[PDB]
C-alpha cells in the first residue's frame, strides 16, 4: 500500500543524470524495480532483450530524438506502454508522439508529483 508499484519494472530513458537520479529515487521508493538508460540508442537496443511494464522518456534527446526511438519500436510491433515527460512546446511533436501511441505527454519539470503518481499507476494498471 505504501509500495504500490512492487512487481512492476520501469525503464527510464533520460540523458540528464540529475533527472535520471530523481526519477530513479521516486519510482524505487514506490516499489518498482528500475532500469535507467542515459542514451536513447542504448535504450532501443535494450528493449530488444526485455519487456518493461512502462518506459519513461523525452521527445528531446541528443543522439536520437524520442520520436525516432518511439517509431523504431512501434514499427517493430513493440507495444511497451510509454509515458513521455518533456519540456517541448512544439505542438506537432506532441501530436506525433500521441499518434505513435504514448499514454500521455507530461510537462517537464514536474509540478504535481502526486498527479504523476496517479498517472503512472494508471499506465501500469489501466481499466
From Swiss-Prot:
Modified residues (4-aspartylphosphate): 58
Inducing factors: Expression is induced during stationary phase by RpoS.
Maturation and modification: Phosphorylated. Phosphorylation stimulates the interaction with RpoS and, therefore, the proteolysis of RpoS.
Effect of loss of the gene: Mutants exhibit nearly constitutively high levels of RpoS and are impaired in the post-transcriptional growth phase-related and osmotic regulation of RpoS. In exponentially growing cells, mutants exhibit significantly reduced levels of polyadenylation and increased stability of specific mRNAs.
Domain notes: Contains an N-terminal receiver domain and a C-terminal output domain that are both required for binding to RpoS. IraP and IraD interact with the N-terminal domain. IraM interacts with the C-terminal domain and, more weakly, the N-terminal domain.
Record function comment: Regulates the turnover of the sigma S factor (RpoS) by promoting its proteolysis in exponentially growing cells. Acts by binding and delivering RpoS to the ClpXP protease. RssB is not co-degraded with RpoS, but is released from the complex and can initiate a new cycle of RpoS recognition and degradation. In stationary phase, could also act as an anti-sigma factor and reduce the ability of RpoS to activate gene expression. Is also involved in the regulation of the mRNA polyadenylation pathway during stationary phase, probably by maintaining the association of PcnB with the degradosome.
Subunit: Binds to RpoS with a stoichiometry of 1:1. Interacts with the anti-adapter proteins IraP, IraD and IraM.
Protein's name according to its UniProt entry: Regulator of RpoS
Species annotation: Escherichia coli (strain K12)
Full protein segment contained here: 1 to 127 of 337
Amino acid at each position: 500500500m505504501t509500495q504500490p508499484l512492487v512487481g512492476k519494472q520501469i525503464l527510464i530513458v533520460e540523458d540528464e543524470q540529475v533527472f535520471r537520479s530523481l526519477l530513479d529515487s521516486w519510482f524505487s521508493s514506490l516499489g518498482a524495480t528500475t532500469v535507467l538508460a542515459a542514451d536513447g540508442v542504448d535504450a532501443l537496443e535494450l528493449l530488444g532483450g526485455f519487456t518493461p511494464d512502462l518506459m519513461i522518456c523525452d521527445i528531446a534527446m541528443p543522439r536520437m530524438n524520442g520520436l525516432k526511438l518511439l517509431e523504431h519500436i512501434r514499427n517493430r510491433g513493440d507495444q511497451t506502454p510509454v509515458l513521455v515527460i518533456s519540456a517541448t512546446e512544439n505542438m506537432a511533436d506532441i501530436a506525433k508522439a500521441l499518434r505513435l501511441g504514448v499514454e500521455d505527454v507530461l510537462l517537464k519539470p514536474v509540478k504535481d508529483l502526486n498527479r504523476l503518481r496517479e498517472m503512472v499507476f494508471a499506465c501500469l494498471y489501466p481499466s
